[PDB]
Design a protein around this ligand. Structure first.
Ligand code: A1CG7
Ligand code: A1CG7
Lengths: 254, 265
């Protein structure tokens, strides 16, 4: 409520939930990527998440490959749209170059653990998402305390930080649901909360359904998180999620 | 695991949410006594909903679409009773009946219905007495200076009305009546404050599926309301609503399982 992020001279208003559309650029191709961004923006996404290294035992990519895949897409979106852009990268060089071409958020699932990443993040002055990876609530909470301190000591202001409990990523079904159930408790940090549950195995394993059959469970997870005041919901299916968020917003507004 | 209803020799365990599938057997859906096999049609639909995980099937034979002509007692009996009977014979689900008529209430009970779900809360002549005589669970549905306070007060008065007629409190369900003389603001206030209705310690039943409170908010037509419906169902269920009345059972059941896994933790 009046919580805000600032980047690239603009601001993101976190008094309501935002839907972050996933834009996978691990598979002309530039134009495809931009058209996909266009669909997600038209569906109501207010942040577009660009990732160029796959996270499925998928192949690692070099610095050079990630630069070649990610940077042109970030740049083309900054030139076409007034939308926030997040980049999924662990690599110092990608962090620095993303900021130069107009990215708003560094979204590192490794929370800046690669050598030089922390320094690169601090130098950009960008918002940074910290994700917990592989009492679960106490473990994740402790992890947040440690990463905030780690970032503060590197010169990164607390107001630049976003927190993500890391659904999936070395977590069993019980552990995923405990985190979901207690998500609101993470507000004690007074930081933005970002969650990614879309199509995850915490739904697949619960319902015994494959990746393409997880829409309803995804929507349920998003609504549960948003009703607990999560700020950013990272999803594959933007339109459906945005419609769900409008129902949440009408409820919370009342 | 705690709160329960009893009817027809079985019990409904309300320690977790139940999905109630809508089965419309009114003139808007099917002929009665015509060439079409409406009975088999109705039962196949019930079967799909049960296979999708519905644990209650809501059967209604009188239309309540704005234009719709009222049906005779005989026609309503002919539409509803065969369907109630067929489900009570075949499937291990509860059956709710949507009727305001004393005769349909009495006959439904005889052939195996578990819940009387009257949107008129038994206000028709004879309905209250017929409901009491059956011994069945009864749903009370509301149909402003303050909408929450008006619905709350309505509940207090109808519970007392039912009690005075010999219906035990342990047979009662409460439904705030989404879309029932209610604009967008009113619908969302009731949804936001749903948990406050637990003070009565009674089952909460809600029906938002495909309603205008979604359609008008999102500017989507009746066949495109699934996401908004799911969101409503989840918001209600996270607030401990007991029964969710829906058209799209499979998706709702999936959503409830996510809720149950969350609440359990
Ligand atoms: C950038 N990113 N990517 C994924 C992709 N799914 C995955 N990757 N590795 N294993 N599964 C993701 O899930 C998330 C998440 O959950 N949170 C946050 N902040 N960023 C994520
Ligand atoms: C039996 N029934 N039927 C409807 C159909 N929708 C409607 N009827 N009239 N105007 N709109 C309904 O919405 C509900 C509801 O919401 N709750 C409960 N307990 N029973 C309902």
């Amino acid at each position: 409520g009046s919580m805000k992020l600032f980047a690239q001279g603009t601001s993101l208003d976190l008094s309501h939930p935002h839907v972050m559309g996933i834009l996978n650029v691990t598979p002309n191709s530039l134009i495809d990527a931009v058209k996909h961004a266009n669909l997600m923006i038209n569906a109501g996404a207010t942040i577009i998440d660009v990732g160029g290294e796959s996270t499925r035992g998928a192949a690692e990519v070099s610095v050079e490959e990630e630069l070649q895949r990610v940077i042109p897409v970030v740049e083309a979106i900054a030139q076409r749209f007034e939308v926030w852009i997040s980049v999924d990268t662990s690599k110092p060089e990608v962090i620095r170059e993303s900021a130069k071409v107009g990215a708003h958020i560094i979204n590192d699932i490794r929370s800046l653990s690669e050598p030089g990443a922390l320094e690169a993040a601090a130098e950009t002055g960008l918002p940074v998402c910290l994700m917990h990876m592989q009492d679960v609530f106490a473990e994740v909470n402790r992890y947040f305390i440690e990463q905030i301190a780690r970032c503060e000591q590197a010169g990164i202001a607390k107001e630049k930080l976003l927190l993500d409990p890391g659904f999936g990523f070395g977590k069993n079904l019980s552990h995923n649901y405990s985190l979901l159930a207690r998500l609101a408790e993470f507000h004690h940090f007074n930081l933005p909360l970002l969650v990614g549950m879309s199509r995850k195995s915490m739904i697949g394993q619960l319902l015994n359904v494959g990746p393409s059959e997880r829409l309803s469970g995804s929507l349920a997870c998003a609504v549960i998180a948003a009703m607990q005041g999560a700020h950013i919901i990272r999803v594959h299916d933007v339109k459906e999620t945005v419609e769900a968020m409008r129902v949440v917003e009408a409820t919370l507004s009342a």
